């Protein structure tokens, strides 16, 4: 038993990681068969970042001013293409510790792992959540871009992100594997509007059952709602609107614990209305929202 | 910027990872050069765990009735020796994906990361501290025996810690990799106290400090304190006594953000009598004590492998 935030592991990932220097600027690429992919800013000075043209930026640029280092290995660049805001460099070797694995783009609300790197060096990894309006809160210095987001189906990468850039906010924005950004974000030092954030309700419910199957109990009220009545408390303190879909995805922790998904609402509406009077539930003297349903069954039934 | 609790990258300890098989009970098992590294207590049925006599269960054990599997690869076990708590498994390979490692005994405060396994194949990864009282709250569910803790210097992994039991409690307690337990735990199904536990004053210092470089500074008080007016406090509170070690650990801190050790434990004080006012610090609602000064040190600074 006990519940903790859990990364994926990183082996298969740390073998993809590669460092992209052009010019003066370094940061970390990720060498899956024969492609290179890195932030297209890799092309960019600290100047050029503030208005950059990446046509124009990149038109200045040959195969031999990408210098890619893969542990003590250099890899030899024979084509380059910018797709969106990633830059895919074509390499003359396909990387022998490439795994199984899928682009995909991820739903806000989603989870995955963070591999944070410097130089094209692993530093750590932790468990991140997409927030509803497309940021992460995550721990990036500078030189963590082209660092990778990610979750295993047993032997299957699945790619989600990679990091881009740090808002003047201090939250996190980056782009997809086919370089396309999660939210309205461009890659240039401007001001940046992130959207209102709200709370992923379904997280918070899926926790609560973590909570339950753990033994914290002490939340669980004689109460129940609609779901009409929760969405009207979930919009007052900024929740995700619970949906059908959101109901059915819990089900199973629902069958498991034999709490209805609308009583464990009903509790989750007294914990909003009525505070947590200074108690915890699995350690956290707040609701925790960075668990979906299937992390906490994973987690819960021991998924390898 | 941002500050998570992150573990080490875990690939050099997943090629490590097997599976150990003794009758029915099968659990992980760390494969080190010609050694398998894993609970003694592979070789119990449900029952002997009540009151074990491992010398003698031991004996009607012999090298073949140790089932071990790489993934799908079956290892010839040539030897068995019982160290204190553990099992050493001679096979007739070496390892090819063992890495630069020592085995070392780490102290009550520190931390480390838990590769979680299942059938000799990696779960998850996680960064704990070892309680004051020598156990940790991990997440660790039936078959998760012999998953190991460690900490990474560079190229060298340092195998701190094996998962042995789960305490009625629910709390975790488990050996370093010579079998010694930490804390007053032995391997059996009995009721074992823990111990009062404390909350670690040099951990929660180091995490204000990383909360003032990611621009948490709302905390920061002009009172100050002595080591003997905080240390009283802190004893009411159940915080461990802060020394003058924990003070010369914290002097990085000191010296990158200006704030004298002092100045941060009167800060502390405030919090721990007055509490947070429903704030949040680093996104935390109370004080977090699983971060050593060397973590926000390392995390603040960018450390590679």
């Not at 201090?170 to 001001?191: C, I, K, M, S």
């Not at 059952?209 to 009545?229: E, P």
Request: proline share 4%; glycine share 8%; with cysteine.
């Amino acid at each position: 038993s006990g519940f903790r935030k859990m990364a994926f592991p990183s082996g298969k990932v740390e073998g993809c990681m590669v460092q992209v220097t052009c010019g003066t600027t370094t940061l970390n690429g990720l060498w899956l068969d024969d492609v290179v992919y890195c932030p297209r800013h890799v092309i960019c000075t600290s100047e050029d970042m503030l208005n950059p043209n990446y046509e124009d930026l990149l038109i200045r640029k040959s195969n031999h001013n990408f210098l890619v280092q893969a542990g003590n290995v250099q890899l030899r660049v024979i084509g380059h293409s910018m797709q969106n805001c990633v830059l895919k460099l074509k390499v003359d070797t396909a990387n022998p510790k490439t795994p199984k694995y899928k682009f995909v783009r991820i739903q806000p609300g989603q989870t995955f792992s963070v591999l944070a790197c410097y130089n094209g060096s692993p530093s750590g990894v932790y468990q991140c959540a997409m927030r509803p309006n497309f940021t992460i809160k995550g721990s990036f210095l500078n030189g963590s871009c082209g660092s990778v987001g990610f979750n295993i189906d047993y032997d299957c990468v699945s790619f989600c992100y990679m990091h881009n850039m740090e808002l003047p906010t201090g939250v996190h924005a980056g782009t997809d594997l086919e370089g396309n950004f999660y939210g309205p974000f461009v890659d240039r030092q401007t001001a940046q509007a992130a959207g209102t954030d709200t709370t992923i309700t379904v997280n918070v419910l899926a926790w609560l059952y973590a909570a339950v199957i753990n033994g914290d109990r002490w939340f669980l009220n004689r109460f129940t709602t609609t779901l009409n009545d929760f969405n009207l408390v979930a919009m007052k303190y900024n929740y995700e609107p619970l949906t059908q879909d959101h109901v059915d995805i819990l089900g199973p922790l629902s069958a498991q614990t034999g709490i209805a998904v609308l009583d464990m609402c009903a509790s989750l509406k007294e914990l909003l209305q009525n505070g947590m009077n200074g108690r915890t539930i699995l350690g956290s003297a707040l609701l925790e929202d960075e668990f979906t349903p299937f992390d906490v069954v994973r987690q819960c039934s021991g998924v390898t």
